[PDB]
Symmetry: D2
Subunit: 114 residues, 4 copies
């Protein structure tokens, strides 16, 4: 199944934050309506916050997360959780290697803000 693609409310701010846990340098791309809106990168095995930003979901609300390590795409897992019918989290893990810890880059998207 497709992973790392979420439908957000239209025209709404959301936070996106990325964490690294790998010997490889991660590159995280955040796409909004199929255009690159943010790119984060770093190298840490201790959960460094390699980027955080507030973005707007635009007219379609379509948000996609892509992760790659020196050009090769990582395998993604994802889900969305809603607490008390209001608070949303979209969660992404990714695997760049063979140990299947799926933490090599971790992306958290949260809304609403403010």
């Amino acid at each position: 199944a497709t992973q790392g693609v979420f439908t957000l409310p239209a025209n709404t701010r959301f936070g996106v934050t990325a964490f690294a846990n790998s010997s490889g340098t991660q590159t995280v791309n955040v796409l909004v309506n199929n255009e690159t809106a943010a790119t984060f990168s770093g190298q840490s095995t201790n959960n460094a916050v390699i980027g955080t930003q507030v973005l707007n979901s635009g007219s379609s609300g379509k948000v996609q997360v892509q992760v790659s390590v020196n050009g090769r795409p990582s395998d993604l897992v994802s889900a969305q959780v809603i607490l008390t019918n209001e608070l949303n989290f979209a969660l992404v893990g990714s695997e760049d290697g063979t140990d299947n810890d799926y933490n090599d880059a971790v992306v958290v998207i949260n809304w609403p803000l403010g």
Copy 2:
């Protein structure tokens, strides 16, 4: 129901990151085995990271998140999610007022690291 309390595997590193979305100054306490292990405090209406730290779950694995604003405990909502039987997220939202957006302090706990 009790919220904000999580059982982690013993002696496991985990990341904790807190965001703020409120006019009020948020104080986030992270307790490991009933003892304060980290405290974050900050104010933002734009999802600013008010703290991030790597902690160890200790011998009991009990982790608890408290949130208060000017000494008043916020109402909490929480859940844990596990992706591909390996990647864990413990998620907390909190409400300090009346609009019930439950984002006034948001806390994300993730493990494993490394």
Copy 3:
């Protein structure tokens, strides 16, 4: 925080399934637009499916779960999870006593159907 209340897309079929795990007889009421649309009752300590039914979310999409044991409301806990940006689960646990296993009546709502 409020629990057991979910907003579904309007005029959408959904499944609702209740399980029991308690010495007390559980009564599960499912409200659609503030009106009782289904009710199930039974006693089991071995996860009996005390009822399963297909309902329609109506014009408002507002779905609420209520659980009581001998007229006393149980304490509820809930969340919603979305898989591959399509498949929705709304999950309810409830506690009728003091052991806080929150399985005394368990309710699963899933959509889409068909």
Copy 4:
């Protein structure tokens, strides 16, 4: 990523319930310790329960769900959710065709029981 595989606590009784939403007949196998422990089959486009059973997770706790339709394995999506640090759901959706509704067989695993 691997989907439909879950590590339960050893020697624990859990419930498993399967629903169908497809023109195809679903066969759902539940494996404990890499052997088939239960098999459900049926056909419905209305979310019928095609089986429900209580099983033991055994010495290793490893549980796996597989779904076959028309002779071929369906693509799976899954996650695990824990509410109030005590109530566990392992959730599986599956796709036997081309419309990607991932509801063609839906499997819910819940524990603890009792």
